[PDB]
Amino acid sequence: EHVRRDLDPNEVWEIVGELGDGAFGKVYKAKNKETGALAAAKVIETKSEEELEDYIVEIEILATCDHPYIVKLLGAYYHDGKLWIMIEFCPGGAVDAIMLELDRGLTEPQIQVVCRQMLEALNFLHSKRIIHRDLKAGNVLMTLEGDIRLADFGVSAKNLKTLQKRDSFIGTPYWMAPEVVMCETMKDTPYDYKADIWSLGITLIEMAQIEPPHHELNPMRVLLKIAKSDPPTLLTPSKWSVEFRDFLKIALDKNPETRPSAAQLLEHPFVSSITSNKALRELVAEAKAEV
Ligand SMILES: COc1ccccc1C1=C(Nc2ccc(C(=O)c3ccccc3)cc2)C(=O)NC1=O
């Protein structure tokens, strides 16, 4: 429905830079030759219809999300042997890249805005039973106006319509909920969506401390560490308000049944009074000043 095979995107889009590479193909920065609008271009070269299903589901996810805090689908093409997914480009970049550029973590007011907007985005997704499943600071993008966009629904799309949990990941899963580490069949429970709430909590600590919990270990031990350890905490509690520590205490619940939902966490005093993104605009403006 959203994929066009008649037109070649190379006549429509000019590749103007490379945003990331991996086994998944590449992500490009692209400028449309007519408008000049920018886009992230996820290009995957594959001819098998099984593999193409996974990526068309990602297009389907983006197409149904009209919420502003999710990256927008700008268009989609398949010809030659490559599928092009054109996605909203966020000039602010990812939060993890911003912390590296500034050589510091976010302030608590900045984390509160990110937390609040992430919670509204998750409440919107979960109401459609879309579970992101791969939250981390690298998948929280920023606009220059100081709002987030959740990105990279690749893991979400490969798990959306199938009943067999894809027990398969790349890299080190610092953000994985303990029931997912233990490979529990969460789809036969009410609590599959709770994995995102745990990942959100880890992402907050990552933004507080620049690196996620257990980043200092040999990466081979992280899964075991997540399964066996008490929930992570802010290691310098005097730096942070009791509301932040309390929010983390309830979100980083190892039991997915009692872990709160995104809607419940929107009632928490850490975010219940956050109405302005000003603190994130300042952060983006300060990051733009460094480069
Ligand atoms: C996290 O964002 C995406 C993630 C995946 C696909 C697209 C995006 C994305 C944007 N920015 C990017 C793209 C890539 C990167 C990377 O460093 C990277 C490196 C290796 C593997 C994956 C990512 C950072 C920001 C953007 O502006 N709109 C989008 O949808």
Task: Provide DSSP, 62-86.
Answer: HHH---TTBPPEEEEEEETTEEEEE
Residues 61 and 170 in one domain: no
- For residue 231 and ligand 1, the question of a CB distance below 6 A is answered with no
Residues 20 and 112 in one domain: no
Question: Whose alpha carbon is nearest atom 16 of ligand 1?
Answer: 20
- For residue 59 and ligand 1, the question of a CB distance below 6 A is answered with no
Cα–Cα nearest to 108, from 253, 238, 230, 215:
238
Beta-carbon neighbour count of residue 282 at 10 Å? 14
44 sits in which H/E element: strand 38-45
Beta bridge partners of 40: 29, 87
Sheet of strand 25-32: strand arrangement? 13-22, 25-32, 38-45, 82-88, 73-79
Residues 210 and 275 in one domain: yes
Question: Whose alpha carbon is nearest atom 6 of ligand 1?
Answer: 152
Q: How far is the CA of 27 from the centre of ligand 1 (A)?
A: 7
Residues 47 and 131 in one domain: no
Residues 6 and 112 in one domain: no
With contact defined as beta carbons under 8 Å apart, do 75 and 64 qualify?
Answer: no
Residues 85 and 203 in one domain: no
Tally the domains of the chain: 2
Rounded Cα distance, 231 and 233, in Å: 7
Rounded Cα distance, 132 and 267, in Å: 22
Method of determination?
X-ray
Residues 80 and 224 in one domain: no
Residues 162 and 48 in one domain: no
Question: Whose alpha carbon is nearest atom 27 of ligand 1?
Answer: 89
Mutate to test the pocket of ligand 1, among 15, 19, 73, 135 (most ligand atoms within 8 A of CB): 19
Last residue of a domain, one of 29, 63, 89: 89
Query: Domain containing 85: what range?
Result: 1-89
Residues 33 and 138 in one domain: no
Does the annotation place 201 within a ligand binding site?
no
Residues 35 and 103 in one domain: no
Q: What is the CATH number of the domain that holds 57?
A: 3.30.200.20
Cα–Cα nearest to 281, from 117, 113, 116:
113
Rounded Cα distance, 69 and 140, in Å: 9
Mutate to test the pocket of ligand 1, among 27, 31, 136, 141 (most ligand atoms within 8 A of CB): 27
- The minimum-distance atom of ligand 1 relative to the CA of 94 is 25
Last residue of a domain, one of 89, 111, 135: 89
Residues 82 and 99 in one domain: no
Cα–Cα nearest to 111, from 95, 132, 129, 124:
95
- The minimum-distance atom of ligand 1 relative to the CA of 21 is 20
